[PDB]
Amino acid sequence: ATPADWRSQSIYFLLTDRFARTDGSTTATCNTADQKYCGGTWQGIIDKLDYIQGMGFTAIWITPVTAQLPQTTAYGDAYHGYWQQDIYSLNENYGTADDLKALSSALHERGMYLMVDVVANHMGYDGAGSSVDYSVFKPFSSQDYFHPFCFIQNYEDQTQVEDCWLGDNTVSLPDLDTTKDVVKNEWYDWVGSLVSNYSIDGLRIDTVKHVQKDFWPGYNKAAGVYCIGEVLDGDPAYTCPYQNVMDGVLNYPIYYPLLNAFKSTSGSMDDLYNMINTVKSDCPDSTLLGTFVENHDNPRFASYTNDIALAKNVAAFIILNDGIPIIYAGQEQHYAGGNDPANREATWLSGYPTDSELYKLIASANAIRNYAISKDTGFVTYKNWPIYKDDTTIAMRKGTDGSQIVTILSNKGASGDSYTLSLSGAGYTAGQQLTEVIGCTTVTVGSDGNVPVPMAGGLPRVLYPTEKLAGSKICS
Numbered sequence: 001a002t003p004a005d006w007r008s009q010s011i012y013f014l015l016t017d018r019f020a021r022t023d024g025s026t027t028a029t030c031n032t033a034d035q036k037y038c039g040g041t042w043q044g045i046i047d048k049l050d051y052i053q054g055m056g057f058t059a060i061w062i063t064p065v066t067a068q069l070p071q072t073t074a075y076g077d078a079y080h081g082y083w084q085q086d087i088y089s090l091n092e093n094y095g096t097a098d099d100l101k102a103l104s105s106a107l108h109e110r111g112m113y114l115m116v117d118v119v120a121n122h123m124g125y126d127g128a129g130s131s132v133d134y135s136v137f138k139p140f141s142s143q144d145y146f147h148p149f150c151f152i153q154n155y156e157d158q159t160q161v162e163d164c165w166l167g168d169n170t171v172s173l174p175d176l177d178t179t180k181d182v183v184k185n186e187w188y189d190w191v192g193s194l195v196s197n198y199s200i201d202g203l204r205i206d207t208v209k210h211v212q213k214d215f216w217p218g219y220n221k222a223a224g225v226y227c228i229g230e231v232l233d234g235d236p237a238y239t240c241p242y243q244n245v246m247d248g249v250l251n252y253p254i255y256y257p258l259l260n261a262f263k264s265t266s267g268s269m270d271d272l273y274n275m276i277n278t279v280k281s282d283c284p285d286s287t288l289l290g291t292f293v294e295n296h297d298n299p300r301f302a303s304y305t306n307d308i309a310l311a312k313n314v315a316a317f318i319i320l321n322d323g324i325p326i327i328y329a330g331q332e333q334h335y336a337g338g339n340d341p342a343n344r345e346a347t348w349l350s351g352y353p354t355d356s357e358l359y360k361l362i363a364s365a366n367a368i369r370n371y372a373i374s375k376d377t378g379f380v381t382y383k384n385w386p387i388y389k390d391d392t393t394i395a396m397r398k399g400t401d402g403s404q405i406v407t408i409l410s411n412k413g414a415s416g417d418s419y420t421l422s423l424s425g426a427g428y429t430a431g432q433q434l435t436e437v438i439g440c441t442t443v444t445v446g447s448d449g450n451v452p453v454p455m456a457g458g459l460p461r462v463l464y465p466t467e468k469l470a471g472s473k474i475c476s
């Protein structure tokens with residue numbers, strides 16, 4: 001599926017090892033500190049697609065599928081998929097080629113997309129750089145395919161970031177020499193054939209900043225689908241230029257101020273407001289970026305705060321911001337693990353309840369986004385507009401005039417006071433009825449064009465015209 005096809009999607013990102021077992025157990029042990037395979041499978045995912053689609057997601061992002069190093073290293077198993085050795089075999093832990101094709105097919109029967117995580121930068125190996133038997137790598141079965149062994153120490157030296165190895169002396173990540181035509185050609189043939197064999201709709205490309213930029217256009221073109229890159233840097237002047245060589249990047253620029261704004265009742269709404277406007281103006285296309293606050297590479301949101309109002313606001317932001325929302329499996333069950341491995345919790349141990357506070361919130365926010373998109377072909381290309389901020393509030397507007405979603409978010413938290421915010425700049429006409437689609441109350445635009453937004457409980461407010469909800473299942 002094309003970048004234009006992907007703008008309307010909403011992604012549930014999961015670890016294949018951690019989301020769902022074939023046996024469907026909600027009690028099978030998964031000690032994150034052990035760093036071992038817990039037994040999640042592609043078939044497990046298929047069996048729980050009602051759970052995912054019930055939140056209004058249109059797509060899943062699964063961790064990498066290639067065969068990995070076999071060892072239980074000092075840092076555990078390759079359960080995450082980022083330590084590949086044989087790119088023409090699948091990780092048998094997750095099932096067979098038929099199981100991966102059945103997951104793609106199951107998603108397509110429900111009108112959903114499959115996005116697969118891929119790594120071009122490196123292989124994995126149990127042991128120090130000097131101990132590497134390059135013959136285990138398929139097809140790159142020679143040192144001649146790799147950059148000489150060295151570690152990245154000077155992160156300001158982009159040449160060293162690209163040419164030296166990730167990992168350490170315990171688990172090394174041998175660095176492919178992506179400047180070699182033979183390596184480019186092998187990767188380009190591989191990615192096009194992966195996409196073809198498994199009917200993959202889009203890719204999340206790992207580790208993008210660690211491969212020189214000239215590699216990426218050929219890789220994105222060979223894939224033949226929308227590619228979103230992991231460029232792990234919060235500076236939009238570093239990260240957004242990657243969108244000149246790849247369709248999208250993960251929105252790490254928004255990540256840091258989004259987390260800071262909502263993780264505390266003292267968070268900066270100014271930094272978030274400012275970064276929305278910087279990305280809007282200075283990134284090649286904010287509507288092809290992926291918005292997130294939680295992943296397997298940072299502490300979960302609820303590790304910073306267990307306040308559920310704060311968690312609802314940040315989830316609403318992720319859904320309603322420019323670009324593709326991305327929610328990480330467990331976020332909807334308020335998982336609070338810290339850094340790796342604590343943030344790789346098994347989703348099945350929640351019992352997959354569809355009545356949890358954040359399952360309901362995410363379902364409500366996805367519902368109005370999916371509905372608005374279905375009625376407004378301009379929604380996904382209207383650049384999100386922050387219209388208001390104060391110490392505890394940010395309001396933003398997105399969508400075609402007359403059909404815009406106006407979202408008011410708060411960091412007051414669950415013991416927030418009750419008050420009326422008089423909101424200017426929403427663009428609705430006087431006397432217009434609006435539905436607040438999270439709590440299903442109505443607000444009327446005043447004679448002056450200001451919206452009297454009832455604030456309470458630190459709750460997020462998501463406004464849409466009542467007249468435009470005719471025939472929808474929203475708020476009845």
Ligand SMILES: *[C@@H]1[C@@H](O)[C@H](CO)[C@@H](O[C@H]2O[C@H](CO)[C@@H](O)[C@H](O)[C@H]2O)[C@H](O)[C@H]1O
Nearest residue numbers: 080082083166167171206207296297340
């Ligand atoms: C992107 C990817 O570049 C990362 C490096 O492989 C990956 O981290 C994985 O490998 C490291 C280093 O061996 C482990 O400590 C992590 O547990 C594992 O996930 C990122 O997760 C991936 O997003």
Ligand SMILES: *[C@@H]1O[C@H](CO)[C@@H](O)[C@H](O)[C@H]1NC(C)=O
Nearest residue numbers: 087088089190191193194197
């Ligand atoms: C896809 O299947 C084709 C035809 O059997 C094979 O040549 C190719 O290596 C496979 N690609 C992947 C990535 O498995």
Ligand SMILES: [Ca+2]
Nearest residue numbers: 162175210211
């Ligand atoms: Ca590299």
